[PDB]
Amino acid sequence: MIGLVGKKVGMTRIFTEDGVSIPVTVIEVEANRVTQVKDLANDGYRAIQVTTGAKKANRVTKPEAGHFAKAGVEAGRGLWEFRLAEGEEFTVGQSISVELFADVKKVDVTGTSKGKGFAGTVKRWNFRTQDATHGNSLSHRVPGSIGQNQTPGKVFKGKKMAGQMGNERVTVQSLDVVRVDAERNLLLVKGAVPGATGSDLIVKPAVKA
Template sequence: MSLGLIGKKVGMTRVFTEAGVSVPVSVVHAPANRITQVRTPEVDGYHSVQVTYGDKKPSRINKPISGQYAKTGVKAGRGLSEFRLESMPADSLKVGTELNAALFSVGQKVSVSGVSKGKGFAGPVKRHNFHMQDATHGNSISHRAHGSTGQCQDPGRVFKGKKMAGQMGNVRVTTKNLEVVQIDTEKDLLLIKGAIPGAPGADVIVKPVIASEVNLPSGEEPVTEDVQQEEVAQDAA
């Protein structure tokens, strides 16, 4: 995992390229993320950075979390999130350091995680894209029903995972390989190509995509930085 940012989904709009092509983008407001804790292998067994962002009334924070903020001297935020790292960066991030939108670059691929919009109790047609049954020909009240749910006495039950009606949405979702189109460091805005999970105003986590998550054609492998440097050296020779 790599270091990312916590932000708030503002909504969607569009931007135009120099060629006049309209590009749909999601706007993420990512104000300065404050580091509240740095975990190390010596103490915790792994590398990670814990951050918070935004503001929250002290009266809305319970005593354990309030004590953690007081111990570190960091202003209380909307919540705490942790980014696990393979190794600590050379500059050694410290408690109180602020991370902003400059962490990303235009054209970079990112993953966005958030809680999807809740749709309530939904039928199989809406929830799982089932085909509708006949509108007539003897069908009375089963137009949007899922039909058979399994066999008879053997096995005598419905298998786990069967697609049926039920709660739709309001689950943790991650959308990968989205491109950063624009960055406004003055307003702390990230413009990301395409749609991202969640309703406007929801918290989202934006992280760089690692090489193993990039969609590549069948049979191809991600090119590492060492291989790229070797190819450049061969071309120069």
Template sequence: MSLSNSLGLLGRKVGMMRLFTDDGDAVPVTVVDVSNNRVTQVKTQENDGYVALQVTFGSRKASRVTKPEAGHLAKAGVEAGEIIQEFRVTAETAGKYAAGATVPATDVFAVGQKVDVQGTSIGKGYAGTIKRHNMSSQRASHGNSRSHNVPGSIGMAQDPGRVFPGKRMTGHLGDVTKTTQNLDVIRIDEARQLLLIKGAIPGSKGGFVTVRPAIKAKASKGAN
């Protein structure tokens, strides 16, 4: 099965903490709440032209749900969630779940597994080239009076007489979809449905994330 067609889970970034190994080493981890992932629809090749599981996470007031979406969720018999997403899966995986079923974390992930985490990065607002593109500042003195943090020249003279498209300049920084790949699952709290993932993941505390099996995970030595 292609890893790009693997079931994942939706969750919320709780925050970061650290765990200690038996040797006393500190391991930074991000806590992700993946509780109550509910299947809202099972898509099949016969009915929809492809196989997928539609999953929702979180809860939303009934007054905040549109009538078409409310009818769709009522048909599945699930509570309205804050986000809905589809995961392309194999027919075998889709056959394990029915609309209204809950997907526990241990059904999808295991300790030591590599995962990819996708989220929306923290918005930084309008930023200069030093912060946005890691450019160097200009001289602090020696005749430089008001050009310390400016980007400098952005083009050439009469030929070509224009600024090339894609020139790195000031602008909006952050608040874009980012994916951090090949992170290790350090621990799974089955009682509270929490994933403890090694390292940092995109987004701020309380932000929504998508956790999938890593698609670029290196196979272990000796594996076929």
């Protein structure tokens, strides 16, 4: 229900003396429907849209054929919405970078968390510690595992044993958008935004309510 393009760095807009404003400025070029899912066939509602167009000279055939209407055009990713009334485009019939959000609404940036990698019980969950007075073997690190005793230890498949942090999605949810820039598509948000450099990102509407 709104384009989705990569972000790049974050800034500050100081006027009237906020400066607190920590813009994310995540460029959102053209979208282009490319496909329109519907009731009969395609399954549910939905409405694909590849809000990109990065020159992809070398691409596998099926995707290179995945386009079909007027200009053709090619991108890479491929999202969609659901209920609405979006066009029947292909990578033709541009959507817009100025989705209908008026000027003061909260967006819902969605990206993939950075990736720490394998991480201890110390970093994964703030529950860990241990002291330094003695027994340096189990220093301020290793936990004291699943309690219980004779209960064979079904370990209750959780606690927080060390494991990689993941890159999993995040969806900050609720973020008032400050600027958009109709033609110089950037759209600034207020801090947050997961991932780095130029992760795909999604930037939904305002479902958070």
